[PDB]
Write an enzyme that holds these catalytic residues in place. Structure first.
Site, mmCIF file in Angstrom:
data_model
loop_
_atom_site.group_PDB
_atom_site.id
_atom_site.type_symbol
_atom_site.label_atom_id
_atom_site.label_comp_id
_atom_site.label_asym_id
_atom_site.label_seq_id
_atom_site.Cartn_x
_atom_site.Cartn_y
_atom_site.Cartn_z
ATOM 1 N N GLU A 22 0.832 -1.194 0.000
ATOM 2 C CA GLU A 22 0.000 0.000 0.000
ATOM 3 C C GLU A 22 0.872 1.251 0.000
ATOM 4 O OE1 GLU A 22 -2.923 0.569 -0.585
ATOM 5 O OE2 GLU A 22 -3.233 2.635 0.087
ATOM 6 N N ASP A 43 -1.913 -5.757 1.010
ATOM 7 C CA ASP A 43 -1.244 -4.597 1.578
ATOM 8 C C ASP A 43 0.120 -4.898 2.181
ATOM 9 O OD1 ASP A 43 -3.398 -2.847 0.970
ATOM 10 O OD2 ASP A 43 -4.470 -3.528 2.759
#
Lengths: 133, 185, 46
Positions: free
Chosen positions: B80, B108
């Site tokens: 991310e 992520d």
């Protein structure tokens, strides 16, 4: 061509119907985006986007191409290019007398003129679809 | 509050939060819904990644310094906060040298010891309402979800806590404090 | 496609390429630090 067979030439008025036909014999038929996924997998594997291989066509081609092109010292740009030309179907309006199959379209210059037909059979086997039609 | 991310957090995260949110329509002045929410998506990643590394054989270590130095390596990668192109180049570079699955939607983080991808998802909902909202949609693949709570109660998949209890205890207190400033803001 | 910088994208790629090239591959441990130091040196030059 090397494995083709020539017959005689007949002289007669040659009727040619303008028609859209394949000009890419052996087009392992896919869309443009589908081929882009295949090309990426083969030559740019680490840089693939989010999408994945969707069909069994895309998977068997990708694994065959990866195997066939293994360790071939050549520009990846040229591999990407030739695969683009090979996979995607391409068509054209052409005046045609007789067989419309792609392998016969490929040799229009050799098999028909204004007043003559050169009987010819390309090397290789006819596809069942064509034979049935 | 627009100065909720600017007075609390440090300068390096402000630029990360300033980045890729610019794409659709809203801006830092409009909403207090998904404006600051993206900020902590990177802070949790840094707390998850920092103070955790791997040894020569392939064993976990929770050390002091935090700058690798030859013999030890980071234990998590920051997916991310990147560009969408680099995001999947990260994901795919992993799957090519460890025969793993490729997740459908973006993860992520990624743990290098256990080879688990981590889709983070903490919110005001307790545990069960947001664990099975994702797990019955990102299923098939074994994407490791770590559902915390705003207070402290915890529930991972099979309660398989790869992270040691010292860091996850401070992770609870990091969200236990930010929860309290929603009312006073 | 991307709104990020040409340099930042290259740096992001340099860090993770060096990662897998060693973590699960065929590049030495000292070389991983030799690259990431240069990415840090480059990141300092803005």
């Amino acid at each position: 061509l090397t494995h083709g067979t020539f017959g005689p030439v007949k002289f007669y008025n040659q009727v040619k119907v303008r028609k859209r036909v394949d000009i890419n014999p052996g087009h392992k038929d896919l869309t443009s985006r589908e081929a882009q996924e295949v090309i990426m997998e083969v030559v740019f594997p680490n840089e693939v986007g989010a999408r994945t291989l969707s069909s069994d066509a895309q998977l068997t081609i990708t694994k065959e191409k990866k195997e066939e092109l293994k360790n071939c010292k050549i520009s990846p740009i040229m591999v990407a290019y030739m695969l683009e030309r090979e996979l995607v179907r391409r068509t054209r309006f052409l005046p045609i007398a007789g067989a419309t199959s792609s392998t016969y379209v490929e040799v229009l210059h050799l098999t028909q003129g204004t007043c003559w037909e050169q009987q010819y059979t390309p090397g290789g086997e006819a596809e069942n679809d064509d034979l049935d039609q | 509050m627009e100065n909720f991310v600017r007075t609390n957090f440090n300068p390096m995260i402000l630029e990360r939060a300033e980045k890729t949110m610019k794409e659709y329509g809203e801006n830092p002045q409009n909403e207090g819904n998904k404006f600051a929410a993206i900020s902590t998506h990177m802070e949790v990643c840094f707390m998850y990644s920092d103070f955790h590394f791997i040894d020569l054989e392939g064993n976990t270590i929770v050390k002091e310094n935090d700058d690798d130095n030859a013999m030890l390596k980071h234990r998590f990668e920051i997916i991310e906060g990147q560009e969408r192109n680099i995001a999947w180049t990260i994901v795919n570079s992993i799957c090519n040298m460890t025969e793993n699955s490729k997740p459908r939607f973006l993860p992520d983080l990624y743990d290098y010891k256990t080879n688990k991808f981590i889709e983070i998802g903490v919110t005001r909902r307790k545990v069960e309402d947001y664990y099975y909202e994702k797990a019955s949609k990102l299923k098939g693949e074994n994407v490791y979800i770590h559902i915390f709570s705003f207070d402290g109660e915890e529930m991972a998949t099979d309660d398989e806590y790869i992270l040691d209890e010292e860091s996850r205890a401070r992770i609870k207190t990091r969200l236990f404090v930010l929860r309290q400033e929603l009312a006073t803001a | 496609i991307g709104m990020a910088s040409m340099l930042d994208a290259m740096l992001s790629r340099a860090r993770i390429d060096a990662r897998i090239d060693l973590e699960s591959g065929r590049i030495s441990s000292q070389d991983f630090s030799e690259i990431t130091n240069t990415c840090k040196a480059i990141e300092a030059l803005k």
